[PDB]
Subunit: 316 residues, 5 copies
């Protein structure tokens, strides 16, 4: 038999509730470039002070998940979560650990699929900046005031995340004053950058294509007298380049149409190989020295093209 002495939010009217958040990223996975999202498991720890549960004697009361519904808990929500759930492995992953002075420790295990934009302009050399924002979904700023428990180091576990492709290169936590239709709210934003592994992509596509085109333009040293050999090398290189392009197109079936960087490099290599074939034909027609078109023509143009490519994907 309880009335208004157990249901109202702490300090209902007056000073807002100071809720201190602590985060512990257990894992990050299912980062899809098609849906532009990421799945992460986090340990959401919330600490606030309530004046109505002061009990004598210094000790802790680790409550179960069944008694969580009997007390007041914050209404934190992930701002851009597309699908999420609280873990129920054997019991409910909801603990409340009350303390003598009224400190409440509310810990949850939540798997969230947050939505972050994948600006895949430079597909293999991109650092996607994805955030995990937490906000009091119902209560405005004047009612609930979110805060980070220990500044930047409140979020833990991100330094141990080594993923299939990405590596965390930076992370920082900030508190904002997000304004929307309902009113003023405090949003706790955790911002981390997912730098891709360029080394695998370099050896997968850039190194083979570079070696192929190098073999193509060093074949000009072979004299025009050996026509069938030159035709064989040209045909084999062109066919290998086409097969590589087709396989690369089929290798990653991601729904992320943003005219990527591998497309540009592959188009450059295809341009150089079929231009080498066309210039073989044109050189035969004009002869009616082939290495004069290699000593200072082809490797130099490809070097300039690579310089422009790397300048594009290096600076702004």
């Amino acid at each position: 038999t309880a009335g208004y002495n157990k249901f109202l939010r702490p300090n209902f009217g007056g000073e807002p509730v100071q809720i201190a958040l602590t985060l512990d990223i257990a894992s990050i996975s299912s980062i899809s470039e098609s849906n532009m999202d990421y799945t992460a498991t986090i340990y959401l720890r919330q600490r606030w002070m309530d004046q109505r549960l002061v009990f004598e004697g210094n000790k802790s009361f680790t409550l179960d998940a069944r008694l969580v519904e009997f007390l007041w808990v914050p209404d934190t929500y992930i701002v851009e979560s597309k699908k999420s759930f609280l873990h129920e492995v054997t019991v409910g992953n909801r603990l409340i650990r009350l303390f003598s002075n009224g400190t409440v420790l509310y810990a949850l295990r939540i798997t969230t699929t947050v939505a972050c934009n994948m600006d895949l302009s430079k597909y293999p050399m991109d650092t996607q900046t994805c955030k995990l924002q937490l906000e009091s979904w119902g209560y405005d700023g004047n009612d609930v005031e979110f805060t980070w428990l220990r500044g930047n180091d409140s979020v833990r576990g991100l330094e141990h995340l080594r993923l299939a492709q990405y590596t965390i290169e930076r992370y920082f936590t900030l508190v904002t004053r997000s304004q929307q239709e309902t009113g003023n709210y405090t949003r706790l934003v955790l911002q981390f950058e997912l730098r891709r592994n360029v080394l695998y992509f370099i050896l997968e596509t850039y190194v083979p294509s570079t070696f192929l085109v190098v073999l193509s333009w060093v074949s000009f040293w072979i004299s025009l007298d050996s026509v069938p050999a030159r035709t064989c090398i040209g045909v084999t290189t062109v066919l290998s380049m086409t097969t590589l392009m087709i396989g690369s197109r089929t290798s990653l079936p991601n729904t992320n149409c943003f005219i990527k960087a591998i497309d540009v490099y592959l188009g450059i290599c295809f341009s150089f190989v079929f231009g080498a074939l066309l210039e073989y034909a044109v050189a035969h027609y004009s002869s009616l020295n082939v290495d004069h078109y290699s000593k200072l023509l082809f490797p130099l143009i490809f070097m300039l093209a690579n310089v422009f490519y790397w300048a594009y994907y290096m600076y702004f």
Copy 2:
């Protein structure tokens, strides 16, 4: 101990309930051409006036999700939703914010998979018109009357949606009088067009095929005396075209059989390349000038074909 004074719909008998809807599209994703649907997360805000909850003093009562079931809430439903759920991240995403004069603000976070037809006649240059209709699923028009809170600008967040392929080019909200078996209903329709990104598809397929066929028909300037060179160019171009067609067929495994536009263009390019091969054979047979069949034959026919293609996909 409550009877009929708390369960009945507001103004039960007489003037219908004027419910004002406000929408906030958080994200749009999972747009599949196979299933012809789209997944969107929205903030459904409903505002109506109830005369039985007038409390003295100007203030707001931000209720939790547990007290939502104790009051009357509308029965809004998405007309063509295939699968949807209300978000439960930490607590229920259902708030009721009562006001002094009886205004009720009912906000929900719902992820919906609505079904919209994908008329993929022009696959890379289509603007799919997909709607998100909201209706009082049980109560007819004479009982519940839906309305947009602020006309066209009631829906927010659609201008910030940049997706993997599509870009929103238009959006407008209207109220209808949908007639069905149960009776008369008010349907709130939000109509938005998803224009595709043609630039990526142009460079992916149209530019390479155009360059290949251009190289094919400019090789007629090469004299018939260099037979092996011509056979090499023709064979390489035909093989490259076939590999490109096969890769394109395997590149997008979408279950959207509508004889698309890329199929038509690829068939045109394949027709031109194998016709070039056949005309090489026929030209040899008839010679028993090859550039006479290029100066005003092949590029001109391809130009006419491209003109017809673009006229088809430009106007009606």
Copy 3:
């Protein structure tokens, strides 16, 4: 405080319950040839007469989903449903609209994955007959008697279904007397045929292969003197045919092994192309007129083969 006056099925003992069913197919999608099923969203309207809820005054009582559990509702089930759920978008999609004389209108929004056999003997020219059967799962025929409200026109919405591949060509509703172990039951069967779109498949595979083989057998008009040209055409056609076959094998990765029709046609085309190559070799050996083997040999055999193919896929 209610006993047996509110829990028992209407007319418990005596005349069975006459429940009239009305169906409204909202959408049909996710038709997979591998799992041999289809996902459909339907509006299940059930109308029966109950004598214990007669209230004075002509009017309707549109009840919510919370009061559905307080009254008796039928136990209709989809006979071959593999996975299904009732929609919960904002509230429960369960309405009961009582009337003065005891008529009860029970409407639900259900998404069902029913299992129907995909006899893919003729893969592109098949009309799969898939049913959506509804039955009183627990109560036998002597207890609950299902009926269609308005005969064939009880089911609505099927005429507006235009899908990715299939088009509805027929639909009809019937009532059966299905016999099983538990007893006698009334099953309401809705039978619809999903005719495939042959036009897309014709232009995708049949037209290119036909053009390729036509080019192959019209090359016999080219004299045997131009040996390298003939070898080039033969090699290019054979390679194109092999690539088309491989791409088609990889194009549709459906788990529906039924030796389909496209396989037969593709095998016929492959047989003709490699037979053309073999007959080139044999013709050279025997010459030691090639068009004598084309004027009345090859196109005529292919015409007979196509006649047999179309006769197989036309009649029985």
Copy 4:
């Protein structure tokens, strides 16, 4: 107000409960070679005798799913189920039909994903023996004694199962005495064999490869004088074989690494084709009759290889 007279298991102490099981396989689908499982929908009928619900008068009481929780029901579980659920289409699929003498008929509609090993040593000619075991998960043998209602014919519906690939060739039901840590249990095992459709796989891979190699070794009758023709046939056959192998590798992307049978046959065909090429080179070198290496060399070795292959996949 009920105590121990309604909650205890029937015959608590003394003779164990004789529960007779009847099974009705509605469908079998989603048989994945990667996860090594199968999804099946079954009608689990359980019949036992309870002495505490004897009511006068011969009649049946078809109870709803809401009253199932008020009575005692067995704790049957599928032994190797990975994920399963009870169907809730419109109401709960749980009926209890009590009878005069205490017979209880408990019928459920359950979709189960049971795990069965896929020994894919002979991928296209395998008969996987997968079981569907049912056991009293909590109560041991001395408490609950499972039994089949009518021996082998208790399981019904398996004879009407025609699947995408497999065909049921045998089925039998047995009762065991499975021993585990908790104690002695009675396990009801339904064992069925899923024989694959070899006819589709024969025509898909074996027939084309056999025809290709036959064409390869009958080309030895062509004299060595026609060198370019022989090189053309050899190159075309080798390229076709390589493309077929690559497509087959990409055709089935199943995660079932068990060095299958199609791999062995394809390796044999690849060995024969590149050996034919190598022997062309070696025959030219040694000539410095080619059909002497065909009359009694190549088709005979391939015949011996096929004999060994079929002996391996025929007997032990």
Copy 5:
């Protein structure tokens, strides 16, 4: 009517609860290299002593899943579980079997998707060490003390696990003292290694590539006089190698970018084949004995490369 005599954890204050865990892995499946996880079904048996449920007479009380919530059960959780659920096949898979002296046997059937890192540096010859850690999620070490019932042999069923690719080669159970923010905890870790099946991968890629390159470098014994034969062999081998590389790239579409071992070996084979082509051209240019570059050049370099490869993937 119960107060604090039935809700508190056993021995609340003083000696911690000694909970003995027993594990029974029913199945392991869905091991994905992309998400770096594994799905396993386990039988979690927990044994502890409670002093408040001592009943006279030696016997067992096998309680149902409905009475589990009425007693105290541990809060065990899987540390790195991404998604998990307790099985509900017919009833709840939660049994409590009390005994005379207070022993409680709590058995559950849980399907867990635990996250373990897939260090795919050596893709076909890796032994991934994945753990299944169980911990008292809420209560610290001073409150709940986890223990293995019978040391290493507490975990059962792992010896019968034969999977699609991996084979368990080792398994061991240990108890730790994991330290985190909340306090001191006892973590029960089961560590097992999943050794891959190298035999399938050897015959799939290593054997064909080795045979191809062997045929390539034994063709040097063929004299330079037979130029067209050498060009044919070289072109066929290069095309076969390129097709094999492309198919392998498309064969496994796993999102596990870690520059794997098959990539290195395939790059080595591609290097050798196109180097053989380049050296054919260079040998022709320099001749202006080819087997002098085979007797002690090519097979020896490939042997050294394979020695280095196997030394890398053998030792450290």
